[PDB]
Write a protein that binds this ligand. Sequence first.
Ligand SMILES: Oc1cc(Cl)cc(Cl)c1O
Ligand SMILES: Oc1cc(Cl)cc(Cl)c1O
Ligand SMILES: [Fe+3]
Ligand SMILES: [Fe+3]
Lengths: 256, 256
Amino acid sequence: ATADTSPERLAAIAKDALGALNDVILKHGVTYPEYRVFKQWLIDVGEGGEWPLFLDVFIEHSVEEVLARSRKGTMGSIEGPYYIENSPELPSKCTLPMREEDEKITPLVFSGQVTDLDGNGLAGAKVELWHADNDGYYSQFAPHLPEWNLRGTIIADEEGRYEITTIQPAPYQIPTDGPTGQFIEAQNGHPWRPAHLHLIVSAPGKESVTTQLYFKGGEWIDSDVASATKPELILDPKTGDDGKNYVTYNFVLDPA
Amino acid sequence: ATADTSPERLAAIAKDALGALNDVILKHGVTYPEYRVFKQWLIDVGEGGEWPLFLDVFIEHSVEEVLARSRKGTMGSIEGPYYIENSPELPSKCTLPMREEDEKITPLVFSGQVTDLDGNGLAGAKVELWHADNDGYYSQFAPHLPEWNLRGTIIADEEGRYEITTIQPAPYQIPTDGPTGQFIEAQNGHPWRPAHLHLIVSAPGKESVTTQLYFKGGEWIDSDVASATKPELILDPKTGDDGKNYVTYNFVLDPA
Ligand SMILES: Oc1cc(Cl)cc(Cl)c1O
Ligand SMILES: Oc1cc(Cl)cc(Cl)c1O
Ligand SMILES: [Fe+3]
Ligand SMILES: [Fe+3]
């Protein structure tokens, strides 16, 4: 990873950030024992490979909020830590890869259209979808799972539309024993994210959008540990006589 | 390391700290490329074992500043990362362990008295002294050095006094290639600490003081990268006809 940042912009960000943290120590009268625990915890975060987790939970929302200002299309949200590039391509009307066991969960049929800002549809738009299974696991972050379970890149047809059948994910819990979980537990917090689909939607000549979609009335919807939920991102699926849940949701992309 | 912190105090510190960092992202419009570099850097800090270095340089000063409020004795300063407990004991009038090569550097003769707050001297006071050599290396953090080079615990006599001969340390440079050095270099900073003695002074029934002492007119005295220098901590050694530098400095300890 690289960025264009000048020495002066970095100096300014650094002075503010560090000044901020020093101000917090002075405000709260942080003690030497607390400092020692803070130091060992930072070390444990790295040793337990949780920098992506901790930052995406506690920081990324502010980075998306910055990005949000320059966008007029559908609301974005954080990528989070579990995105994998180049998920296998599926047809405009498809079902995500899933195990037999996934197949016993009430189906979720997700329809809509990728369009531009004036409302014109888009040929060759791709919807990358990833989410957790009913157990709350992601493929490639759970050895039992086929590597593309509930992962795909859907090719939207000439008109910019898709019909993706999947399952509704379960809410996600940050493992309690890790440093991030330990951090949460020490302040009497909830290590939970509401159930969510992750999507990256792209089209030729267009600025891709990373977003998440949530489920009306679902638990933790009002207390996401990642501060990543937005009202505009909440789905209200309706159930069909096949007992399947149906939702339609359209994506609106900005120009590149 | 453990601390007594309640879930509510931790919650409050966390909300402030995180809120602070999020506020900085929003202020400066931190970008996704910058976030990715920030994430890989945090990972590199841990992989390069620099959490003690980075925190002691950029944070510890605020923790000592908090501690300073409750103390009426000599000014403290940060411990920094290179303290080692149980350095071998030496007599009230002693010379620190050093190599032949150290012995060609103009001697520093450091005298004074450990006393209480009303000015009474103290039997069985210990002055733990550690510092870098003329090359800027610490023993136990440099494989070529004898493990207690320029390290000792001096036993102050019945009256609370010592006469420690050593050398003046060189200024210390944070290695430029590490993540901390890289951080400094990216903002056009100086990776330098002024030359300094580290001392932990203790006495029976007394609250120990961690401090540092610096050298008047020495370089980086006005721009310590650790923000750890104080006016009260600056020595003005006088040179003797043996061409040795002499300084006297007294420690005043609080009750435990
Ligand atoms: O699946 C996730 C897991 C974590 Cl820890 C954080 C976010 Cl934002 C996720 O989307
Ligand atoms: O010897 C030192 C080295 C670093 Cl990096 C920081 C401090 Cl505060 C020191 O005293
Ligand atoms: Fe997720
Ligand atoms: Fe030092």
